[PDB]
Structures are given as structure tokens and as C-alpha cells.
């Protein structure tokens, strides 16, 4: 009797070797995201993604930078922002992002969350049974479930 799967390399576990692997892989994110939602911490990952989109934008290009900087800001970083991220807007970014943003400045904030979750969520994500769901299929050799399908409430 065969054991495990012979389809592709170990991706389920690859989400433990490092963080870069968690994102790089479309599966590691689909599951990670859901987890956060469990405790209404999506904003954590939602914010990070945004940055990547902003930072990527060149400095010269303002039309875009602004649109994003402002949106992203008033989105997570603001006084009445729906859900403020752990990050502190004390960086007086507004006054900046508003007048003239920076495709590098964010690099700092974005990183803040990256590490936060990496030690906040990323850590638990593995401790939780959800992540294991894919593990069993990897060690056993079965298909992977659907994060969304998985009930937030534990057994």
C-alpha cells in the first residue's frame, strides 16, 4: 500500500519552512486569510497585501501613489478608519501620503505587520487544527479541504 502523494512537492509543510513560502503559495494564503477572519483579524493580512501593491508603484508616478496612499491610509490608518491595524499612524504619514507619498516609506509599516503576524497569526495558524487539515492529506495522501468550508467553531 502506497503512502502519501506523488503529485507535486510538499507545499503544505513548505508553509512552515518560512513565511515567504506562505505567501508565494496560493494555498498558504487561502488558508492563512481564513484563519485571521476567525478572530476578525483579516485587516492584518488585508493591509499587508495593499502595501505590496502601493510600494511596487514608482515614485515618479503620483496619480497612482496618491490614490493608493490615501485609500490605504483612510482604509486602515485613520482616525475613523473601519479597522485600525496594529501599526500606529503616529508616523504622521497622512501629512505625507496626502501631499507626497513614498513608494519606500511604506516599506516600514508593511514590515511591521509582516513580522507581527509571523509571530502572532503565522504562529497560531500552525498551532490550530485548520493548518493540520492539509497536513493529514500530505502525510496520508488525500486531497485538501476548503478553508472557507471549514467551520470557524472548533470541535
Q: Are 67 and 15 found together in one domain? A: no
Task: Round to whole Å and give the CA distance between 119 and 15.
Answer: 14
Q: Are 75 and 35 found together in one domain? A: no
Task: Name the residue among 149, 113, 148 with its Cα closest to residue 37.
Answer: 148
Residue 2: left if φ>0, alpha if ψ -120 to 50, beta else—which one?
A: beta
Judged on CB neighbours under 10 Å (0-12, 13-18, 19+), 40 is: exposed
Q: Are 20 and 85 found together in one domain? A: no
Torsion of CA 120, 123, 127, 129, to 10 degrees: 80
Provide the CA 56 distance to its chain's centre, in angstroms.
16
Assign 3-class secondary structure to the chain. Answer: CCCCCCCCCCCCCHHHHCHHHHHHCHHHHHHHHHHHHHCCCHHHHHHHHHHHHHHHCCCCCHHHHHHHHHHHHHHHCCCCCCCCCCCCHHHCHHHHHHHCCCCCHHHHHHHHHHHHHHHCHHHHHHHCHHHHHHHHHHHHCCCCCCCCCCCCCCC
Q: What is the CATH number of the domain that holds 52?
A: 1.10.167.10
Assign 3-class secondary structure to 18-60. Answer: CHHHHHHCHHHHHHHHHHHHHCCCHHHHHHHHHHHHHHHCCCC
Q: What is the CATH number of the domain that holds 29?
A: 1.10.196.10
The residue segments making up the domain with residue 35 are 3-39+121-151
User: Do residues 13 and 126 lie in contact, with contact meaning Cβ atoms separated by under 8 Å?
Assistant: no
Amino acid at each position: 500500500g502506497s503512502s502519501g502523494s506523488s503529485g507535486r512537492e510538499r507545499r503544505v509543510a513548505s508553509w512552515a519552512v518560512s513565511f515567504e513560502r506562505l505567501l508565494q503559495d496560493p494555498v498558504g494564503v487561502r488558508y492563512f486569510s481564513d484563519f485571521l477572519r476567525k478572530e476578525f483579524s483579516e485587516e492584518n493580512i488585508l493591509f499587508w497585501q495593499a502595501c505590496e501593491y502601493f510600494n511596487h508603484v514608482p515614485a515618479h508616478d503620483k496619480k497612482e501613489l496618491s490614490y493608493r496612499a490615501r485609500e490605504i491610509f483612510s482604509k486602515f490608518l485613520c482616525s475613523k478608519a473601519t479597522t485600525p491595524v496594529n501599526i500606529d499612524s503616529q508616523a504622521q504619514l497622512a501629512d505625507d501620503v496626502l501631499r507626497a507619498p513614498h513608494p519606500d516609506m511604506f516599506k516600514e509599516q508593511q514590515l511591521q505587520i509582516f513580522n507581527l503576524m509571523k509571530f502572532d497569526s503565522y504562529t497560531r495558524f500552525l498551532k490550530s487544527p485548520l493548518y493540520q487539515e492539509c497536513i493529514l492529506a500530505e502525510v496520508e495522501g488525500r486531497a485538501l479541504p476548503d478553508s472557507q468550508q471549514v467551520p470557524s467553531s472548533p470541535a
